UniProtKB/Swiss-Prot annotation:
One of its GO terms (biological process) is formation of translation preinitiation complex. Gene3D superfamilies: P-loop containing nucleotide triphosphate hydrolases (3.40.50.300), Translation factors (2.40.30.10). This is Translation initiation factor 2 subunit gamma. It comes from Saccharolobus solfataricus (strain ATCC 35092 / DSM 1617 / JCM 11322 / P2) (Sulfolobus solfataricus). Residues 92-95 are annotated as: G3. Pfam families: eIF2_C, GTP_EFTU.
Length: 414
């Protein structure tokens, strides 16, 4: 039989609103991550979507139909059992132009990504643009482009967009990114996408010796498939492990942590706890590693782990030395253009005293610019951030025409 292991790789699913990201995830995994009624009433889904699947291959059958997402070779007409390859998970990021912060939060978790392009819309739409550039800034360059909704366009219409997409990727880091046509709604050519995932999003090397760090995704910020148990021993803290491994009973801390307000002054103090359980889906494990959304069961009271007063951005081992900073210095670069705007706009230079939005790990922090000198800015944050390394790239956004627009990036200097 197929083993029950954690997912070993996170694949983002990005692209413009209504291009079919959530449907594509369902096509691969059988899971519909969002709530249809809420998406109807709000006109968008604001939470990250999450789903997992096994990947196998029917060694008797031919490609790409030999690739399967279940332990059956029926789809290629064989009764042999498929060879298990790996378990993978998907981060379904929002496309709506007001949700760039949530996309950037999800992009911190991706080992690769799929950019979904609708074939019946003019390429490239503003968030096709903005998400593509965001992926390149952040370093998620194991990319597959998917031309979705081919069922509604002619052969000539798909070919014509295909040429637009090749012209767009030409002369960029994505110049050799494959372009796979599919219908997510009717599950057309999904096996070729699976074949592409195996070829172009190989599981990354994990140095399991590094200090364990998990980026936190608050439960109210993500839609995950249904759970059998909500852990009894205390509140659960979910997220994705970006380095090292965590083990049951290890002492850990949640950073920045709990808001404490005493004699006027405000601080965020670390919340120490201990790993009571480790879950992926509804499977229990003794350890957790990078790849997948893990549920870390603690002994904390659920009223703390779900509190808004808890600034839970990362989890580390209890003895890790992690600065928690209200003021940070960023070595920054700006984009030439505001790629995600509808109008053609140049990015203005960073002015002192303006408000910026900083994406660090999975967290989102507003800040004021106290100092601009050359290519370094100094920012006084509204809430501190936990800088777990000296190597951390933040993404910078500015409010433009009543939306948060990605305008550049930087290195957080400590
Ligand atoms: N005709 C057709 N419609 C599709 C296809 N994929 C998605 N859709 C429709 O496009 C709309 C938006 O899809 P959705 O998955 O919610 O897009 P998202 O905003 O990117 O998550 C839905 O009404 C889908 O049923 C497709 O392959 N063909
Ligand atoms: Mg969606
Ligand atoms: Mg149909
Ligand atoms: Na077609």
């Amino acid at each position: 039989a197929w083993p029950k292991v954690q997912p070993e790789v996170n694949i983002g699913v990005v692209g413009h609103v209504d291009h079919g990201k959530t449907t594509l995830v369902q096509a691969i995994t059988g899971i519909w991550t969002s709530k249809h009624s809420e998406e109807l009433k709000r006109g968008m889904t604001i939470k990250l979507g999450y789903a997992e699947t096994n990947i196998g291959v029917c060694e008797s059958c031919k490609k790409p139909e030999a690739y399967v997402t279940e332990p059956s070779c029926k789809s290629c007409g064989s009764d042999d059992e498929p060879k298990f390859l790996r378990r993978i998970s998907f981060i379904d990021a929002p496309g709506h132009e007001v949700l760039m912060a949530t996309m950037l939060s999800g992009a911190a978790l991706m080992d690769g990504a799929i950019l979904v392009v609708a074939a019946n819309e003019p390429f490239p739409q503003p968030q096709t643009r903005e998400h593509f550039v965001a992926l390149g800034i952040i370093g998620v360059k194991n990319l597959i482009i998917v031309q979705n909704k081919v069922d509604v366009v002619s052969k000539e219409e798909a070919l014509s967009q295909y040429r637009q997409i090749k012209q767009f990727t030409k002369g960029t880091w994505a110049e050799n990114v494959p372009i796979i046509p599919v219908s997510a709604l009717h599950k057309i050519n999904i096996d070729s996408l699976i074949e592409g995932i195996e070829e172009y999003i190989k599981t990354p090397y994990r140095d399991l010796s590094q200090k364990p760090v998990m980026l936190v995704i608050r439960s109210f910020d993500v839609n995950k498939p249904g759970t059998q148990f909500n852990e009894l021993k205390g509140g659960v803290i979910g997220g994705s492990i970006i380095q090292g491994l965590f083990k049951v009973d290890q002492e850990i801390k949640v950073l920045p942590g709990l808001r404490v307000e005493k004699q006027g002054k405000v601080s965020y103090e670390p919340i120490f706890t201990k790993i009571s359980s480790i879950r992926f889906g509804d499977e229990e494990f003794k350890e957790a590693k990078p790849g997948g959304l893990v549920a870390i069961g603690t002994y904390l009271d659920p009223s703390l782990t779900k509190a808004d007063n808890l600034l839970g951005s990362i989890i580390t081992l209890a003895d890790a030395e992690v600065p928690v900073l209200w003021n940070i210095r960023i070595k920054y670069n700006l984009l030439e253009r505001v790629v995600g705007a509808k109008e053609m706009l140049k990015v203005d230079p960073i002015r002192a005293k303006e408000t910026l939005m900083l994406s660090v790990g999975s967290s989102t922090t507003l800040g004021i610019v106290t100092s601009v000198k050359k290519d370094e800015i100094e920012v006084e944050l509204r809430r501190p951030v936990a800088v777990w390394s000296n190597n951390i790239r933040t993404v910078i956004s500015r409010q433009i025409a009543g939306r948060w627009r990605m305008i550049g990036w930087g290195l957080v200097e400590i």
